[PDB]
Design a protein around this ligand. Structure first.
Ligand SMILES: *[C@@H]1O[C@H](CO)[C@@H](O)[C@H](O)[C@H]1NC(C)=O
Ligand SMILES: *[C@@H]1O[C@H](CO)[C@@H](O)[C@H](O)[C@H]1NC(C)=O
Ligand SMILES: [Cu+2]
Ligand SMILES: [Cu+2]
Ligand SMILES: [Cu+2]
Ligand SMILES: [Mg+2]
Ligand SMILES: [Mg+2]
Ligand SMILES: [Mg+2]
Lengths: 325, 325, 325
């Protein structure tokens, strides 16, 4: 029941054809009849997390299915983490499986996929499971619009096919020379999995501490940056400049990619100045935040909420900077 | 070891500074003297001589016949290594012999600087009058036109006296006050003040420079106020203040050259500050300015560990000069 | 003589025809013969405020009559507050009335009107007095120039009349749609009177504390702003943008109003950037001040002159913020 074979098959089934109601009769039956609140002894918190999520569901406060999802959207992230919190409290696999099946059919698919992945990664119940590659679970997030269009045409015409992916832009765009780095599907899996392993929303009340996370955050991104610059050097290009909030972003981008639901990803023109983003931040807020971080660095200490100093002139200083940055 | 002999030694050391010494005694010393041969001549038992000799032997010192700037961190460090040796000499023969030895090994700009501050800050220098730098290194005080006539006079082996005119044209209203900042004595006043009160001074060199940070404020306040009095005398308004986010209205063409290194660069009128690679971003200057004003308006300077140093007191202006210079 | 009838009559007479020497013979006699320094027992401060003001008057240091007055001008405010301070120390009405009559004939009329108003408001001697509307005491400050000119014409021709006011701007100016809000004479009296009741220059040594003043400062202006936006919404306009020191002020203004003495109020063009104001502040100073206030808010504490923390994570915090803003 909780053998590796059954848990793996359950996860495979839950992630199969994620944009449609489940086609597996056993999962259909669970989603119809299981009650996340029916027996709260299955949870290490006696049902607190399930109560939170069920109240949001019953009050019609959750993001609808067939809608874009972004982990950087505060409310959508909070909704995905409500499901993660339920899965994380499950004592045994049948709780994990049944809640996953129940909420798969109620919740936005992007939120669901995210919660199930981090639930598997951060629960002991997920030990031994191999998560399918996200580029086959949500291929729109890893595949350009031209190839997706060819897939839609194959499906409309009921014909199989294999379609070649090319890079975006043209040869006139020198940045295309290094598209094989940031568009590589495995490099993108590396990146999302690092953040799934070391999420910025992690709280140790979820079960365990993530050792040196803030320093690993610095290091993994330093390595992405240094590796990209090595590809630029390999292709007769100069190193990337750094962004600054008061200077133009020289290199624009046309993704030529689309969401499954939500439309095409937006383009950014060349040589644009940063503008304030309504509901996110003013450009000036970013500059102030940057200044405050540099104040801590140049002071040698981070300032606590009550004004006391937290020394960063020690080996953990870089980690604490990762935490606040 | 008397004042007459010390003065003559200095005169000889500074003579024809761009060429190997022409004095047989100094050539013999430069050939045979070992700065490490008798450490009993130093107050540090040779520590400073060891540092400089290692740099020399590792071929890490600036070559002869090359521009020198005291604001260049590594070139300053090299000059100060020679200063440190001279400053450790207990008796004049140590001072003279090390000067003669390193005159033939080190960059001439570094050597002249180190010899001047060595004479000024060693008791062995008492009673010596340093020659005016405008005759030791005339390129730094003489426009390129007149140097060329000197070069021509030398190429043709004919004596002459050549008139120096101020830079610019009569269309340039700033030329009305060129007699202030271009006065060779005003230039010597300025270099000598900084030789007497150097920003690199550490009291481990032997003594404290009393009220240095306040004298730094005062001497430059007086230069600024005196310049404005010349502007007033010539139907000009006071100078504006610089700001990092506004144009520098008045450009400048020095029409002067280094002996080695080429012509001094020109600045066009009405330019915005640009970031200087290897030095600072313009934004860094604004942040530094803000931090200084934070101390002034707080009434205290913040120490490295975060504790406050009160500046609402007579020494506050001195501490501000310490942190601003 | 201290009856409400007589006190009201006295105030009416003092404020009548304020730009001319008093036409009331009894006030004339007081102004000629009263000595503010003639009986220290009149005052709760043993006569000190009267001495302070008389010294400024006798030294010819006070602003002349027939001159513009601005409460935001430090020296002019200080002079008005010297008269307030005298009135505020009077024990009995005859001291208050006699000092007001004396200084009416010696001091600038704008300073005098201001001091008399705040004196009545903040003295128990003022209880029961109704202050005349300032739009009839100094009508220039509430009446556009065209109507004032018609009033001048009526006086030149000795012919009574009533003249219609009809809002600044043209119909081409969408901002004119809501001119009835900020130009309403009663709204302007509301605003001046709030500041007279809760003056930023108040010190509790004047006699009493003004409860929750800093929070009421936030609230009354929040309500002015929210009420203006409701008028904009009523007139098919969007809400006002917020000012930014580094961004253009989109909407200019032509007051089409004049001082009695000092000339026409100045116009501001559309779409201008803030410029430094000589004798007031640099635009950058405003940005730094704003940054420091936001530092306190985001720290959760205000920083005292000696660096210690003043907690604002409590109900009085908004009041302390009003105090510092
Ligand atoms: C140089 O100046 C001197 C005096 O200042 C004058 O006698 C002489 O004519 C000048 N020489 C030239 C070439 O103008
Ligand atoms: C002024 O207004 C009144 C009433 O609104 C009107 O009767 C009168 O004609 C107006 N005068 C002018 C000059 O418009
Ligand atoms: Cu990342
Ligand atoms: Cu200087
Ligand atoms: Cu107000
Ligand atoms: Mg070079
Ligand atoms: Mg008068
Ligand atoms: Mg200010």
């Amino acid at each position: 029941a909780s053998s590796t074979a059954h848990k793996q098959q359950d996860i495979n089934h839950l992630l199969d054809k994620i944009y449609e109601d489940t086609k597996y009769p056993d999962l259909q039956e669970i989603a119809k009849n299981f009650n996340p609140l029916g027996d709260t002894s299955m949870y290490n918190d006696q049902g607190a997390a399930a109560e939170v999520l069920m109240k949001e569901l019953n009050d019609h406060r959750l993001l609808e299915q067939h809608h874009w999802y972004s982990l950087f959207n505060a409310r959508q992230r909070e909704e995905a983490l409500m499901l993660f919190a339920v899965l994380n409290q499950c004592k045994v696999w049948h709780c994990f499986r049944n809640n996953a099946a129940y909420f798969r059919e109620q919740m936005n698919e992007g939120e669901f996929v995210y919660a199930l992945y981090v639930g598997v990664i951060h629960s002991k119940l997920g030990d031994g499971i191999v998560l399918p590659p996200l580029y086959e679970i949500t291929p729109h997030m890893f595949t350009n619009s031209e190839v997706i269009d060819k897939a839609y045409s194959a499906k409309m015409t009921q014909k199989a096919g294999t379609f070649n992916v090319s890079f975006t832009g043209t040869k006139k765009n020198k940045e295309q020379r290094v598209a094989y780095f940031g568009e590589d599907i495995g490099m993108n899996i590396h990146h999302v999995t690092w953040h799934m392993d070391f999420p910025f929303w992690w709280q140790d009340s979820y079960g365990n501490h993530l050792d040196r996370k803030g320093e690993l955050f610095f290091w993994v991104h330093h390595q992405l940056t240094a590796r990209f610059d090595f590809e630029r050097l390999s292709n007769w290009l100069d190193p990337v400049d750094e962004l600054h909030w008061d200077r133009i972003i020289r290199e624009g981008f046309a993704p030529l990619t689309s969401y499954k639901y939500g439309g095409e990803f937006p383009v950014r023109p060349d040589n644009k100045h940063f503008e304030d983003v309504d509901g996110v931040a003013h450009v000036h807020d970013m500059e102030i935040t940057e200044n405050r971080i540099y104040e801590a660095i140049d002071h040698g200490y981070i300032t606590a909420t009550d004004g006391h100093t937290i020394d960063i002139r020690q080996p953990k200083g870089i980690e604490l900077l990762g935490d606040i940055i | 070891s008397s004042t007459a002999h010390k003065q003559q030694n200095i005169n000889h050391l500074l003579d024809k500074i761009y060429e190997d010494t022409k004095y047989p005694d100094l050539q013999e010393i430069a050939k045979n003297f070992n700065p490490l041969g008798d450490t009993s001549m130093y107050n540090d038992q040779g520590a400073a001589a060891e540092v400089l000799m290692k740099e020399l032997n590792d071929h890490r010192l600036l070559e002869q016949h090359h521009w020198y700037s005291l604001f260049n961190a590594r070139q300053r460090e090299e000059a100060l290594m020679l200063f440190a040796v001279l400053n450790q000499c207990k008796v004049w023969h140590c001072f003279r012999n090390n000067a003669a030895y390193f005159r033939e090994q080190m960059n001439e700009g570094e050597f002249v600087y180190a010899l001047y501050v060595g004479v000024i800050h060693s008791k062995l220098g008492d009673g010596i009058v340093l020659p005016p730098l405008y005759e030791i290194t005339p390129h730094m005080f003489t426009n390129s036109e007149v140097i060329d006539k000197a070069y021509s006079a030398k190429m043709t082996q004919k004596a002459g006296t050549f008139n120096v005119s101020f830079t610019g044209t009569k269309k340039n209203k700033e030329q009305r006050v060129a007699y202030f900042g271009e006065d060779i004595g005003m230039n010597i006043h300025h270099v000598t003040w900084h030789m007497d009160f150097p920003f690199w001074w550490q009291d481990s060199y032997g003594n404290h420079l009393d009220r240095k940070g306040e004298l730094f404020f005062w001497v430059h306040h007086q230069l600024t106020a005196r310049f404005d009095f010349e502007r007033l005398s010539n139907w000009l308004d006071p100078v504006d203040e610089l700001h990092w986010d506004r144009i520098i209205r008045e450009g400048f063409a020095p029409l002067t050259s280094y002996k080695y290194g080429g012509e001094f660069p020109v600045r066009p009128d009405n330019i915005h500050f640009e970031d200087v690679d290897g030095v600072a971003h313009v934004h860094d200057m604004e942040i530094t300015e803000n931090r200084i004003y934070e101390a002034i308006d707080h009434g205290y300077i913040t120490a490295t560990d975060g504790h406050t140093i009160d500046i609402r007191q007579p020494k506050g202006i001195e501490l501000l000069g310490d942190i601003i210079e | 003589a201290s009856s409400t009838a007589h006190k009201q009559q006295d105030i009416n007479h003092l404020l009548d025809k304020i730009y001319e020497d008093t036409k009331y013979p009894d006030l004339q006699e007081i102004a000629k013969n009263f000595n503010p320094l003639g009986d220290t027992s009149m005052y709760n401060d043993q006569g000190a405020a009267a001495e302070v003001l008389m010294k400024e008057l006798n030294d010819h240091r006070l602003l002349e009559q027939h001159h513009w007055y601005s409460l935001f001008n430090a020296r002019q405010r200080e002079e008005a507050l010297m008269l307030f301070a005298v009135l505020n120390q009077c024990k009995v009405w005859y001291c208050f009335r006699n000092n007001a009559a004396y200084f009416r004939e010696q001091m600038n009329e704008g300073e005098f009107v201001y001091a008399l108003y705040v004196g009545v408001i903040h003295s128990k001697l003022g209880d029961g007095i109704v202050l005349p509307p300032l739009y009839e005491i100094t009508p220039h400050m509430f009446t556009n120039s065209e109507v004032i000119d018609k009033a001048y014409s009526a006086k030149m021709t000795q012919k009574a009349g009533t003249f219609n006011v009809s809002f600044t701007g043209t119909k081409k100016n969408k901002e004119q749609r809501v001119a009835y809000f900020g130009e309403d004479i009663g709204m302007n009296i509301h605003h001046v009177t709030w500041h007279m009741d809760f003056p930023f220059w108040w010190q509790d040594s004047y006699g009493n504390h003004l409860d929750r003043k800093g929070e009421l400062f936030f609230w009354v202006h929040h309500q002015l702003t929210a009420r203006f936006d409701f008028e904009r919404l009523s007139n098919w306009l969007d809400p006002v943008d917020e000012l930014h020191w580094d961004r253009i002020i989109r909407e200019g203004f032509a007051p089409l109003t004049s001082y009695k003495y000092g000339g026409e109020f100045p116009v501001r063009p559309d779409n201008i950037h803030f410029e430094d104001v000589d004798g007031v502040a640099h635009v950058h100073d405003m940005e730094i001040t704003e940054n420091r206030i936001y530092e306190a808010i985001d720290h959760g504490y205000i920083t005292a002159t000696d660096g210690h923390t003043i907690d604002i994570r409590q109900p009085k915090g908004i009041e302390l913020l009003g105090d510092i803003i």
